[model samples]
Target: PIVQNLQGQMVHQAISPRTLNAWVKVVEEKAFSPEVIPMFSALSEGATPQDLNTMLNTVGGHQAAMQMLKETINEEAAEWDRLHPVHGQMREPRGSDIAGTTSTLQEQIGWMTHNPPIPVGEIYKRWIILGLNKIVRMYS
Candidate 1:
């Protein structure tokens, strides 16, 4: 019920290539709506540490996610002056001045909670078919 593993560090692996591409596209759009979309508008941009952690925890599931969520907020709060956007200056919303900002992940996930999500257990298990070899690979 809580914290389901999607194989890779990001939830991209949990969905189909088409869907993953869409998410990546959104991330790259640099749209960071904070109201309609996830923390990042499209991936190329960065998120406020609080929003970042909240999104991560939501994807990570409850419990641990909550702990991580709080830590991110506290860390960001203390370093408000230093928060930098992945693309530009990481400043708080205009005129907000980083005063006890709490997002709206509740608002974000509200629809999902009321409707519930499809549990991983109920989905068919699929594998990428990579051979196990304790190996790490990087590409540019």
Candidate 2:
């Protein structure tokens, strides 16, 4: 196995629980997309990092999990761009946008290109927390 577990711990701890807690609130604050969010509710609540079937229980599958998080990042980016260029980046919901930066959804499916993930043999498991941790870190 790789550092999946190691990384999981680092993300929740290294960043400091304050930031961790902040993002947790932000996640709970954001209207999570259907299956995607609910799948990890226990995780979001603070369980053993990445152990909650976040492995393959990713609602749709491992791939879709990646896309959903990717989608969320995209929306937040544009919202911030608009805020900076058009509305002066107020921390409050700008114009007709949300207050906190945010998340989006999917469009397609494909394989990882470079250094692709090691095959998901019995070798390893899902990375929802690691994934969600970074996802939250980025736009949280």
Candidate 3:
């Protein structure tokens, strides 16, 4: 019901700042990218893990949040690509699966997996690492 239009999905509940951080980490890579998204700064103001548990508590909630997470990641990812361009070819995805945000975290640990529609693809692999580690903190 909170974190409207500006956040992830055009429609959905609020997400944790840490969760949002993961999306940014993969796409933004602030350490490397010249600048990060403005909204990323906006999303984290006074946020907490509350939404993490809230989304995890329900299937629909979890699914939508992950969808929204990807939404911003892909969009910001393009921005990141512009900030930091790549060269040569990205190795085969299976070289390492496109680590995706899991809609349902109730499943196995590897619930996070997606084959994105390449550099952002490889970059996608590491993005999940930051955000998922944060989300896992919400778990038991």
Candidate 4:
């Protein structure tokens, strides 16, 4: 089942806390190779928007997660430039320029897609649960 945030916004709730914790444990145990470790490291350091969206998609369907990430990025982008002044009175060093340039959601999506670190796994568990639930309901 899907989940929502305080504002009734969809959130990545397909992955349970227990499952996430277990994944972390597996990582800690060095179950994966050194090459794969860097990918995980990026998560701790800083994941790009594309990478984050890819991760979200693993928990749920790509459409929902992608939309959620888009909204999240938009909010962050807006906050990053919340205090902008008009008339080109001042210039932001970096990043705020993005907000100034892209005014539409399509533009924002394009910007994020152009950026790097575009990145999924262990998502099928949710599908399995949903299918089982449907089967049980049909019988009962």
lDDT of 2 by residue, 1-140 (tens): 11225445312212234534544454445624333344444334322222222332333333644575445545554554575554321132221122111211000000001133212111111233345655445544
User: Per-model C-alpha lDDT, please?
Assistant: 0.29, 0.33, 0.37, 0.35
Q: Pairing residues by index, what is the TM-score of model 3?
A: 0.25
Better of 2 and 3 by TM-score: 3
Candidate 4 lDDT tens digits, 1-140: 23356997533334345544543553346432343234344332222233333344443443443344345445544554454433312222222334223233233333333334111111222222233233334334
Q: Rank the candidates by TM-score, best first.
A: 4, 3, 1, 2
On lDDT, the stronger of 1 and 2 is: 2
Q: What is the TM-score of each candidate against the true structure?
A: 0.24, 0.23, 0.25, 0.26
User: Best candidate per TM-score, number?
Assistant: 4
The sequence of per-residue lDDT tens digits that candidate 3 reaches over residues 1-140 is 12236555323245656665564454335422313333333433322223333332332345544555455456645555566454422233221122323222211112122133233222543343344443433331
Candidate 1 residue lDDT tens string, 70-134: 45444544453355331222222211122214423332223222334321111111000010010
lDDT of 1 at 111: 21
Worst 10 residues of 2 by lDDT: 104-113
- Model 1 poorest ten-residue lDDT run: 125-134
| lDDT score of residue 110 within candidate 1 | 30
The runs of at least 3 residues in candidate 3 whose Cα sits more than 4 Å from the true structure, single-residue gaps closed, are 1-61, 64-68, 71-79, 85-120, 138-140
